[PDB]
């Protein structure tokens, strides 16, 4: 019996991820001193990972266990259209947290007049609209005809679609993140006292470290898939086998299941908030 092991492992991982991403939302939505414009973006990342790990991953698990799509033809398009939108929304959410931290560090005295509540909400709406456009843009542009067996659900391999998706979903926010963090690290290295007091300085110097840990986990998890796909799509000589392909896109789902453990370990308000939520 080989299906039992994979079924138990993937079911346990999904059932861990759903409860983690519910607990992250509940710990911010319960307490009152955690109400600022920075924590709402963490709630947004938790919402995107919750929708992914509660809608998409069971059907790919059953597809990996059985070996053929046994639900029809209309669901094979809806699944492959939600699977791209969730990852694109998560990457652009990380990019907007990086921009917010740069504006917070570089102008430490005129921050509560620049980043108000209204501009944060409008930036959230603009990010969701741009993600929904750039995700399902090229999916309906490189449309190929369907086979005649309907027990198979495959993906596109036109080099235009692969190039457009890999250029508009991964390598465009990465440059913005690295430019903002390079300028922020130079300013933190060269200065003595940021906000005119010791307490505000030592409180400002730690959220940047937490967001560095989050970005460092995300890049390490999602880089080999977006590095092994277009090389095999363009140059067909160095295409790998069908067994090493199936790990480089399961790492990207392990990332969504492993994300909510960073906040209790690398903080002291999140641990108290998690314990207070679990107390009830």
């Amino acid at each position, epitope marked *: 019996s080989k299906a039992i092991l994979l079924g138990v492992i993937l079911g346990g991982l999904i059932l861990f991820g759903v409860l983690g991403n519910i607990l992250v939302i509940l710990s911010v939505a319960c307490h009152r001193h955690l109400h600022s414009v920075t924590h709402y973006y963490i709630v947004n990342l938790a919402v995107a990972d919750l929708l992914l790990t509660s809608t998409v991953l069971p059907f790919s698990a059953i597809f990996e266990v059985l070996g053929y799509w046994a639900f029809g033809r209309v669901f094979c398009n809806i699944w492959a259209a939600v699977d791209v939108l969730c990852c694109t929304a998560r990457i652009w959410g990380l990019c907007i947290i990086s921009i917010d931290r740069y504006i917070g560090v570089s102008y430490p005295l005129r921050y509560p007049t620049i980043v108000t509540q209204r501009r944060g909400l409008m930036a959230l709406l603009c990010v969701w609209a741009l993600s929904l456009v750039i995700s399902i843009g090229p999916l309906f542009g490189w449309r190929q005809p369907a086979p005649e067996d309907e027990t198979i659900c495959q993906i596109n391999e036109e080099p235009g679609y692969v190039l457009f998706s890999a250029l508009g979903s991964f390598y465009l926010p990465l440059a913005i993140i690295l430019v903002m963090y390079t300028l922020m690290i130079l300013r*933190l*290295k060269s200065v*003595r*006292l940021l906000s005119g007091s*010791r307490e505000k*300085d*030592r409180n400002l*110097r*730690r959220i940047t*470290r937490l967001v560095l840990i989050v970005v460092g986990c995300f890049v390490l998890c999602w880089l080999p898939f977006f590095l092994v796909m277009p090389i095999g799509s363009f140059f067909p000589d160095f295409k790998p086998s069908e067994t090493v392909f199936k790990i480089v896109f399961w790492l990207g789902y392990l990332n969504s299941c492993i994300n909510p453990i960073i906040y209790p370990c690398s903080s002291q308000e999140f641990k108290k908030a998690f314990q207070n939520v679990l107390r009830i």
Partner: nanobody
Amino acid sequence: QVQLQESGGGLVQAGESLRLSCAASGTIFRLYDMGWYRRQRELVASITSGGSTKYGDSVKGRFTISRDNAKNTVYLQMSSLKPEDTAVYYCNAEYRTGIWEELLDGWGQGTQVTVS
């Protein structure tokens, strides 16, 4: 765990010259400020990281303050000493021990100079 060491004490009559020195040792990321304090705490000399010096009111600038950055050392040159300068002098420093850390200072032991 950063510790400071002082040197340059003595005991002589009035109308002479001397030089004191202070130096840090330990694990440091950067040093931001140094100085000297008489007796009771009061300012007599203070220098910055850039080089813009400052002085105190009880002394009319007759001493000299200088800083060696690469060895983490601060000096003090005293000349034409008055009989009213018999006290105990102390060093000081400010530092940091990491880029994600908190600024915190630390005092030193002290040195004795006796003049008549």
